[PDB]
Design a protein around this ligand. Structure first.
Ligand SMILES: CCCCCCCCCCCCCCCCCC(=O)OC[C@H](COP(=O)([O-])OCC(O)COP(=O)([O-])OC[C@@H](COC(=O)CCCCCCCCCCCCCCCCC)OC(=O)CCCCCCCCCCCCCCCCC)OC(=O)CCCCCCCCCCCCCCCCC
Ligand SMILES: CCCCCCCCCCCCCCCCCC(=O)OC[C@H](COP(=O)([O-])OCC(O)COP(=O)([O-])OC[C@@H](COC(=O)CCCCCCCCCCCCCCCCC)OC(=O)CCCCCCCCCCCCCCCCC)OC(=O)CCCCCCCCCCCCCCCCC
Ligand SMILES: CCCCCCCCCCCCCCCCCC(=O)OC[C@H](COP(=O)(O)OCCN)OC(=O)CCCCCCCCCCCCCCCCC
Ligand SMILES: CCCCCCCCCCCCCCCCCC(=O)OC[C@H](COP(=O)(O)OCCN)OC(=O)CCCCCCCCCCCCCCCCC
Ligand SMILES: CCCCCCCCCCCCCCCCCC(=O)OC[C@H](COP(=O)(O)OCCN)OC(=O)CCCCCCCCCCCCCCCCC
Ligand SMILES: CCCCCCCCCCCCCCCCCC(=O)OC[C@H](COP(=O)(O)OCCN)OC(=O)CCCCCCCCCCCCCCCCC
Ligand SMILES: CCCCCCCCCCCCCCCCCC(=O)OC[C@H](COP(=O)(O)OCCN)OC(=O)CCCCCCCCCCCCCCCCC
Ligand SMILES: CCCCCCCCCCCCCCCCCC(=O)OC[C@H](COP(=O)(O)OCCN)OC(=O)CCCCCCCCCCCCCCCCC
Lengths: 97, 459, 27, 63, 139, 120, 344, 39, 47, 98, 52, 52
């Protein structure tokens, strides 16, 4: 974990760099967004497991349950966009200028 | 001092509740009496000033003004009964109330012990004034004038807000009484040299200094007559009252931190006086006359010699009354002429015999004719300025010669010469117009009999 | 040793001194 | 009513304002002290509550 | 960071080289950051065009940094006064002028001179009077 | 700030300790202000809804002048307490930590020598 | 909306901030933030206009990544202290993350780009909720953790917001976006005093809520999203012209009105803490905010813009009234200043 | 006297999606009143 | 009168009675609170 | 061009109401708005006010000081004391920095 | 916290499980339970500024 | 007589209230009632207040 918690953390930052620099398809962000939730879920589960802190295992899952719906909302917005613009491409999302 | 104030507030209920036809007389008649209650503060009979209560006080410097602030509300409401008599009966009751709030606020500001009470009330007076100038302003440019009047005062105001909160932390209370009887001696650092500028600059802005006075010519030009009277008579003097009470602290720095302003004002006095010499708009000329005669005041509230201060107190009350008188008669010509141009309307004495006598006395008050408080004032500021440096007479000597020239030119090209051939025929003078004037000058004659009352704190 | 609990302000309330001492509010 | 009333009224106004001023400054000093000292009722930031520490006999023997 | 701070440690007017170097860097750093925001938003048309803009902003900023540093340091030595805020104003005065030139505008030089110099002067005063910026809560 | 104080009532409005303080006089200028503040709310409402300004909703006018005022007494009653706690707290500390707030002797002006800058 | 759905959503949009505030286990504070994100998105697209889908998709991505960053801070803390909550010991970077993240959800400073755009594509109503009942949640989390956050960053985000908000507002003519910009600015003052006196943040918020809620219900009474649209207020409903005037000048800091108190006491507290550098610059550009407020004043009240004949038709018909809240929140806001001491 | 009430032209400026129009910003056009677009 | 009979033609008599009656409950609780309050204050302190 | 009104002329209020006093168009309001303004304006402010202001007694003590001087000058001269000694706060009271 | 509706209502839905020394299921003590106790019974009554 | 003269009584009434409120300011600021140095005298016979 000393260096196994640095890989996961950098994974979250590499996923951070991803969600923040868009490029064409919006799905790739959402998908990326999810890459973080996995990294957070893995790190939370890892430390809870090596702290033998069983009282906290509820959290690793609450994180996923809320993240799943969060993503559900995200995809419905995505479907709504390629119903109004025929694509998920972000450039289209420039009306509010 | 809640009779000069509470009865005032009640004016607002009267302007609203009263009949549309009788609204004007109830308000004007009652505030004349409100002025009579104001006269009670003049009963000093002892050195100890009058601390009515914790928040409200009146000392020799404020008392001469509170009475003027109460006095002009009647007059303001009498000078604006003509224009503003074409309104919908709810625009009037708004204008009347706006004028009422100005003196309620101004009476309190001049009668306030806590310096930040001054600030809150000080900067509030802009709300009523900006509405009077922008909402009823005749010209297309009042939106602009309003902006200039709000920003120049506001940008100056926030530095004072920081400074006064700063001294409260440094000393522990912004109570003018204590601040006076406590040891607040700035230490001539670079920072203090900034504090001093922070406190004085907001006051120096509404007291037009040569550098920042462009707001006043623009504001009075398009402002309605009542707003122009308020700005010249009470609003500009708010800056002077502030400089007198704020320099009790910041005692050491002004000895050497004043030179910049003093020179700005005395050279400013000459140039502002001179441009009056060729300005086509009469309201424009009176406004620059106001800048120059107020540039003398910032040059006496900075030399800080006993005589300066009461020279200042004499001139401020006197010039206040005179300027309004000039702005009020300018309006009477403007309403019949329908143009502010000085060149048109030549020869009026031929057609308005008396208004011309009022014009003549107003001009003689404008220039320094001697049995007038106006001259006593300048004579005193002149003396101290001479004491500061004998050379000052040269610059305060070019202003006197120029002041004579523009004051008489206003009389010579407006009230003499051949009559204008046929402008819209000029209807005779109303008795209101003439009284509004008489009400300005009869007090100028009475005050000149006993100058002691308006002499300031120093003497 | 455990640390010492902060001391306890003691007494009964008395109307505040001179009132809210905010800028110019006689209160 | 007289010179007596204003002189005595002004002294009462000064005492209230002097006493208010001394207290306002002392507040600022007390508030500087308790923030850094943390030895006074103000600025007593929270830490977990021992009312949840489980002092029960646990399964392992070193708890 | 021990670096930038050095600027302050040695008395003003002395060791101008280090002063100018440090001041130039800060300006340049700001240049990069400024160009970055300028490229991220209001993007360019071609990568090269944007690389140029980064360069332009970086150099201009580096220049204002240098002249500020150089003028203030030199104004000090010449004037034989190391703590006269005016020094900095002359420096800020100059800095603004460089900005004005790089923008090819006399007017900008005007506002630039006054505004920029005033700001720098205030920095000197700030240091002289021990003004505290972004202070910790001490209530 | 004042939270975290010993005995703090975690969600209470005004702890009974505030009984010890004097009750706000119903005519306290402030409560009277709240009253006027209220009447105006009422009048304003009538205006925005285009009703005779003063002669309408004379029942509402009362609800307003009487809701605002009711609120006041019970608010001021508290704010008054909060301020009163502040002194209890402040004064106490000045003593419990006396050395830090030491009484000072102020030399009679006779002794002190503030410099005199002449105006001339 | 099937009224049942309306209830579930509205309950969530309301359970969302409330769980955040009530709980201490940060995790439970995070899901409170998460529920607010999920509940607001349906309402945002109610018209389902092409602009709307854009609004929600931005709001959601900005909100979601910030939510993930806040969770990362909680996850990291869990390993630096077993506790699920920030403590004195917390690594400084851990707290700074929470500031940036929470300053994105609240939309302060260099993350102020999403708010103006989502405020532009959502209805006036949902605009209010998006501006004021969604700021309570994140601010709660910050106010709780104030003792630990950095004075430097907050100040920078504070000052930046003030500037961005002001400058942005000057150019804007769409009302929804003028308000979005004001909110950025006021939000800035609030976060400036958080490290020093959180209790004042809660005043500079309430007053903002008691000022903005009347202002928006005013904009929608005539549903005008344009200044030109609000300028013809004099014909559509003349009475609100008086209070709209004072509330907007109150939103800016002018002294007689209630709006001065938040700025005045924040400046007093910052000078008490010695930030007389920072406080001064903030107050100065705060004055820029009033310029655009008064420019609107000009168009709506002090000057009467020309209207359309078809307006006479809308006058004829009885105007659906403004709720009572407008009045009670207009007066308590425009003039409570005489009662400041008890407010603070 | 007719205190000058604003004419159409004074009103015009306040239209447009940005008050102080920029070089490229002016190219923009005001948002649709209905909040719904034609695309 | 009105083509479309004003909805406000005849008072909502409930709105009067909960507006009037509510206010009279406010006072009777408020005035009660004060005298009750005064007492406790007086006795809580010596008098 | 948009619809707007044709310039309103300003009436010669002196054509009807040839006794116009300048306050209001209908005659009775005018008469009663000058009969109350000259009265409350001049008749009981410039007159009763000046009466009261004239009778304020010894304003700012300058009527008291021209006697106190006279008895001090009477007392100082006859007892041989300097009329205005040159230090006011006695030197003995002062504790000059030693 | 910001609004303590929990202490007031007496409910403890969010406090029972905030630290490693809280009740662990089946009383399987956590790790570092020997210390967190010692580090929170110490900082109890002493505010943070002096728990640091 | 309240028929348009109840309007005329508004301001006159404000004066009365004003003076009252004002004379209830003196009553408050009555410390140093007669304890001032320049004006301290023994209450002359039948006088319980030097200044009221
Ligand atoms: C008292 C009264 C005194 C009166 C004096 C006389 C006044 C005369 C009347 C006024 C007048 O004539 O003005 C005409 C003049 C005509 O120019 P303009 O039409 O406004 O053109 C500006 C447009 O943006 C041009 O549009 P554009 O599309 O070309 O945009 C490009 C942009 C940029 O210009 C360029 O294309 C070249 C790049 C220049 C900036 C590169 C670095 C950017 C760094 C950003 C850092 C962010 C953090 O142009 C500008 O924005 C110019 C203003 C730049 C402001 C300074 C930015 C920082 C640069 C220096 C950093 C130094 C750091 C030292 C440590 O108007 C002005 O420029 C007024 C002054 C503008 C700001 C000057 C600098 C003030 C701030 C100083 C620094 C901060 C101190 C605190
Ligand atoms: C007129 C309505 C009269 C209704 C009378 C009802 C019966 C009644 O109230 O008489 C018993 C009651 C007996 O009073 P008391 O206890 O004998 O008074 C002695 C106190 O020493 C005298 O009171 P105090 O002054 O010692 O009270 C402490 C505090 C009390 O604080 C207040 O009550 C503030 C009231 C402000 C009005 O004093 C202050 O007012 C400090 C604040 C001064 C103003 C600060 C703000 C100035 C700038 C903003 C001005 C307003 C702008 C509004 C926004 C813009 C609107 C366009 O009379 C009153 O308290 C009410 C007096 C009038 C209240 C204000 C009415 C307006
Ligand atoms: C901190 C950085 C500060 C940068 C400040 C300046 C930013 C300027 C950005 C615009 C520069 C000028 C245009 C460049 C266009 C370009 O090619 O790169 C954008 C890049 C790809 O996205 P795309 O939409 O395909 O655009 C390609 C257009 N030619 O966009 C993306 O990369 C989208 C993100 C996905 C790919 C990168 C994700 C991070 C990967 C990190 C891996 C490790 C890298 C180590 C080095
Ligand atoms: C335009 C009209 C004139 C405006 C003048 C503004 C002057 C600067 C703002 C107010 C300055 C001030 O309040 O002066 C005193 C203040 C603190 O000085 P001091 O008491 O020495 O405290 C520092 C530690 N001893 O010293 C300062 O606050 C200096 C602050 C300098 C930078 C303030 C922001 C300037 C923005 C322009
Ligand atoms: C717009 C201007 C209107 C007219 C203004 C006329 C008065 C201006 C006076 C300004 C100067 C006032 C005195 C300032 C101090 C001058 C130095 C001084 O101390 O005065 C003494 C001096 C006699 O000294 P003495 O040893 O004889 O040597 C001569 C040179 N000092 O005696 C002096 O030299 C005094 C200096 C001149 C004072 C008399 C000026 C007469 C001007 C005549 C007309 C000039 C053109 C106008
Ligand atoms: C001995 C006298 C020394 C005077 C030093 C100060 C003035 C120096 C002027 C040098 C020439 C500057 C110049 O010509 O440029 C004016 C500048 C840009 O003008 P622009 O419209 O770009 O056209 C210029 C085309 N060559 O336009 C500007 O922005 C000018 C800004 C500086 C103005 C300096 C003078 C200001 C006077 C203020 C007086 C206030 C009272
Ligand atoms: C019990 C009454 C007698 C005692 C009252 C004592 C009040 C003392 C404090 C006064 C404070 C100043 C404001 C006074 C406003 C009085 C308004 C009023 O009395 O209402 C009658 C007035 C009639 O005018 P109008 O609006 O044309 O209505 C006619 C029918 N449509 O309708 C109006 O004009 C309403 C105007 C409301 C102004 C509110 C101002 C609040 C602050 C500015 C916003
Ligand atoms: C602290 C003092 C601050 C300054 C106080 C004085 C200024 C108050 C703020 C005024 C701001 C708005 C100015 C411009 C308003 C323009 C209104 C207008 O053009 O008129 C139309 C408007 C609506 O007409 P409507 O009432 O529907 O007509 C009824 C017909 N039967 O007509 C109306 O709206 C009429 C009702 C307006 C509301 C009444 C305002 C009366 C004046 C308030 C004075 C308050 C004095 C406070 C003094 C405090 C002292 C400490």
């Amino acid at each position: 974990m000393p260096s196994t918690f640095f890989n996961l953390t950098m994974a979250f930052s590499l996923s951070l760099l991803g969600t923040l620099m868009f490029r064409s398809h919006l799905m790739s962000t959402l998908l990326c967004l999810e890459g973080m939730v996995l990294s957070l879920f893995i790190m939370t589960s890892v430390t809870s497991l090596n702290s033998n802190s069983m009282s906290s295992m509820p959290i690793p899952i609450t994180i996923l349950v809320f993240a799943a719906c969060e993503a559900a909302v995200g995809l419905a917005l995505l479907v709504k966009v390629s119903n109004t613009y025929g694509t998920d491409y972000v450039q289209n999302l420039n009306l509010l200028q | 001092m809640l009779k000069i104030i509470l009865p005032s507030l009640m004016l607002l209920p009267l302007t609203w509740l009263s009949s549309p036809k009788k609204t004007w007389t109830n308000v004007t008649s009652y505030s004349f009496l409100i002025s009579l209650t104001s006269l009670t503060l003049l009963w000093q009979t002892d050195e100890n000033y009058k601390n009515f209560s914790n928040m409200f006080s009146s000392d020799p410097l404020s008392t001469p003004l509170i009475i003027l602030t109460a006095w002009l509300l009647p007059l303001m409401l009498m000078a604006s009964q003509n224009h503003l008599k074409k309104d919908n009966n709810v625009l009037q009751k708004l204008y009347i109330s706006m004028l009422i709030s100005l003196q309620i606020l101004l009476i309190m500001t001049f009668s306030a012990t806590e310096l930040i009470m001054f600030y809150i009330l000080f900067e509030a007076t802009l709300i009523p004034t900006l509405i009077i100038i922008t909402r009823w302003g005749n010209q297309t440019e009042r939106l602009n004038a309003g902006i200039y009047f709000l920003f120049y005062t506001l940008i100056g105001s926030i530095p004072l807000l920081i400074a006064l909160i700063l001294i409260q932390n440094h000393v522990g209370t912004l109570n003018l009484m204590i601040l006076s009887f406590t040891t607040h001696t700035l230490d001539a650092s670079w920072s203090n040299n900034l504090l001093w500028l922070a406190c004085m600059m907001a006051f120096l802005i509404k007291m037009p200094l040569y550098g920042v006075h462009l707001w006043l010519p623009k504001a009075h030009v398009e402002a309605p007559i009542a707003g122009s009277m308020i700005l010249a008579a009470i609003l500009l003097k708010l800056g002077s009252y502030g400089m007198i009470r704020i320099s009790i602290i910041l005692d050491p720095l002004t000895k050497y931190m004043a030179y910049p302003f003093i020179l700005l004002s005395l050279w400013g006095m000459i140039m502002t006086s001179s441009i009056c010499l060729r300005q086509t708009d009469l309201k424009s000329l009176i406004a620059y006359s106001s800048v120059s005669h107020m540039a003398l005041v910032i040059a006496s509230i900075m030399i800080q010699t006993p005589w300066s201060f009461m020279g200042a107190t004499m001139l401020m009350i006197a010039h206040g009354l005179t300027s309004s008188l000039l702005f009020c008669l300018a309006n009477s010509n403007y309403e019949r002429i329908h143009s502010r141009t000085m060149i048109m309307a030549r020869g009026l004495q031929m057609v308005f015999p008396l208004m011309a006598t009022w014009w003549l006395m107003a001009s003689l008050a404008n220039l320094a004719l001697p049995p007038s408080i106006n001259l006593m004032g300048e004579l005193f500021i002149t003396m101290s300025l001479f004491s500061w440096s004998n050379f000052t007479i040269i610059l305060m000597g070019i202003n006197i010669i120029i002041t004579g020239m523009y004051s008489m030119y206003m009389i010579i090209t407006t009230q003499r010469g051949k009559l204008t051939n046929h402008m819209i025929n000029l209807q005779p003078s109303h008795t209101r117009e003439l009284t509004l004037m008489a009400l300005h000058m009869i007090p100028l004659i009475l005050l000149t009999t006993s100058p002691k009352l308006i002499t300031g704190l120093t003497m | 040793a455990r640390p010492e609990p902060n001391p306890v302000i003691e007494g009964d309330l008395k109307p505040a001194k001179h009132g809210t001492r905010f800028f110019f509010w006689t209160v | 009513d007289g010179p007596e009333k204003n002189y005595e009224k002004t002294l009462a106004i000064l005492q209230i304002e002097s006493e208010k001023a001394e207290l306002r400054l002392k507040e600022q000093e007390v508030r500087r002290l308790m923030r850094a000292r943390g030895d006074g009722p103000w600025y007593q930031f929270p830490t977990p509550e021992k009312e949840f520490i489980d002092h029960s006999p646990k399964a392992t023997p070193d708890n | 960071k021990r670096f930038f701070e050095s600027y302050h440690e040695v008395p003003d007017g002395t060791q101008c080289h280090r002063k100018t170097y440090i001041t130039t860097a800060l300006g340049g750093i700001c240049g990069i950051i400024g160009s970055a925001y300028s490229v991220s938003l209001n993007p360019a048309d071609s990568t090269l065009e944007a690389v140029a803009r980064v360069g332009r902003y970086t150099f201009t900023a580096a220049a204002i940094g240098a002249m500020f540093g150089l003028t203030t340091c030199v104004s000090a030595q010449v004037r034989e006064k190391p703590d006269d805020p005016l020094n900095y104003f002359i420096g800020g005065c100059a800095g603004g002028l460089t900005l004005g030139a790089r923008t090819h505008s006399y007017g900008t030089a005007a506002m630039g001179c006054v505004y920029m110099g005033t700001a720098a002067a205030l920095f000197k005063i700030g240091k002289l009077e021990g003004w505290e910026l972004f202070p910790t809560p001490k209530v | 700030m004042m939270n975290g104080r010993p005995g703090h009532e975690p969600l209470k409005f005004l702890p009974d300790e505030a009984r010890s303080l004097p009750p706000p006089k119903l005519n306290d200028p402030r409560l009277v202000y709240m009253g006027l503040l209220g009447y105006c709310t009422g009048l304003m409402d009538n205006m925005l809804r285009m009703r005779p300004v003063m002669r309408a909703g004379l029942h509402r006018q009362l609800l307003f002048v009487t809701s605002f005022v009711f609120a006041g007494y019970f608010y001021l009653k508290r704010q008054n307490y909060l301020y009163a706690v502040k002194d209890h707290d402040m004064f106490g500390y000045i003593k419990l930590h006396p050395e830090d707030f030491p009484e000072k002797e102020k030399k009679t002006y006779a002794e002190i020598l503030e410099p005199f800058h002449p105006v001339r | 909306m099937n009224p049942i759905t309306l209830a579930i959503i509205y309950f969530t949009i309301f359970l969302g901030p409330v769980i955040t505030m009530s709980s201490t286990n940060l995790m439970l504070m995070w899901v409170g933030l998460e529920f607010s994100l999920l509940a607001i998105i349906p309402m945002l697209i109610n018209k389902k206009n092409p602009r709307s889908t854009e609004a929600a998709t931005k709001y959601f991505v900005t909100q979601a990544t910030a939510s993930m960053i806040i969770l990362l801070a909680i996850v990291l803390n869990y390993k630096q202290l077993g506790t699920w909550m920030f403590q004195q010991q917390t690594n400084g970077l851990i707290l700074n993350m929470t500031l940036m993240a929470l300053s994105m959800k609240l939309g302060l400073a260099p993350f102020h780009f999403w708010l103006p755009e989502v405020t532009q594509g959502i209805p006036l109503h949902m605009g209010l909720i998006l501006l004021t009942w969604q700021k309570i949640a994140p601010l709660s989390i910050l106010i709780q953790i104030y003792p630990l956050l950095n004075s430097t960053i907050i100040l920078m985000l504070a000052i930046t917001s003030i500037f961005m908000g002001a400058w942005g507002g000057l150019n804007q003519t769409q009302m929804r976006k003028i308000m979005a910009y004001s909110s950025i600015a006021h939000m800035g003052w609030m976060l400036a005093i958080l490290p020093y006196n959180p209790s004042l943040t809660l005043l500079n918020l309430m007053i903002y809520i008691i000022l903005t809620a009347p202002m928006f219900m005013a904009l929608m009474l005539n549903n005008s999203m344009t200044i030109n649209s609000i300028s013809l207020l004099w014909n559509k409903t003349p009475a609100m012209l008086t209070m709209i005037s004072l509330m907007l000048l109150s939103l800016g800091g002018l002294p007689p009105l209630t709006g001065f108190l938040p700025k005045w006491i924040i400046i007093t507290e910052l000078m008490k803490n010695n930030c007389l550098i920072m406080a001064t610059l903030m107050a100065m550009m705060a004055l820029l905010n009033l310029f655009f407020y008064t420019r609107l004043i000009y168009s709506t009240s002090l000057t009467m813009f020309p209207t359309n004949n078809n307006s006479k038709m809308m006058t004829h018909q009885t105007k659906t009234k403004p709720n009572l809240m407008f009045s009670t929140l207009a007066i308590m806001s425009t003039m409570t200043l005489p009662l400041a001491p008890q407010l603070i | 006297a007719r205190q000058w009430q604003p004419d159409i032209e004074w009103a015009e400026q306040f239209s447009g999606a940005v008050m102080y129009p920029s070089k490229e910003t002016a190219h923009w056009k005001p948002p649709p009143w209905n909040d719904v677009d034609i695309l | 009168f009105y083509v479309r009979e004003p909805v406000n033609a005849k008072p909502n008599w409930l709105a009067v009675g909960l507006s009037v009656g509510a206010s009279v409950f406010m006072w009777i609780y408020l005035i009660q609170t004060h005298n009750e309050d005064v007492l406790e204050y007086k006795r809580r302190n010596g008098l | 061009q948009w619809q707007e009104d044709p310039e309103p002329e300003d009436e010669n209020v002196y054509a009807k109401n040839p006794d116009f006093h300048g306050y209001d168009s209908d005659p009775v309001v005018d008469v009663w708005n000058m009969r109350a303004v000259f009265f409350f304006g001049f008749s009981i402010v410039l007159v009763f006010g000046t009466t009261f202001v004239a009778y304020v007694p010894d304003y700012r003590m300058q009527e008291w000081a021209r006697r106190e001087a006279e008895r001090l000058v009477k007392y100082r001269e006859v007892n041989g004391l300097p009329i205005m000694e040159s230090n006011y706060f006695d030197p003995s009271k002062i504790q000059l920095p030693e | 916290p910001f609004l303590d509706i929990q202490k007031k209502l007496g409910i403890s839905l969010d406090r029972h499980f905030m630290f490693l020394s809280a009740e662990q299921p089946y009383k399987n003590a956590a790790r570092c339970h020997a210390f967190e106790k010692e580090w929170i019974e110490c900082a109890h009554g002493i505010g943070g500024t002096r728990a640091k | 007589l309240l028929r348009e003269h109840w309007v005329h009584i508004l301001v006159p009434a404000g004066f009365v209230f004003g003076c009252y409120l004002d004379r209830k300011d003196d009553e408050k600021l009555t410390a140093f009632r007669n304890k001032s140095m320049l004006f301290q005298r023994e209450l002359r016979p039948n006088e319980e207040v030097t200044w009221k």
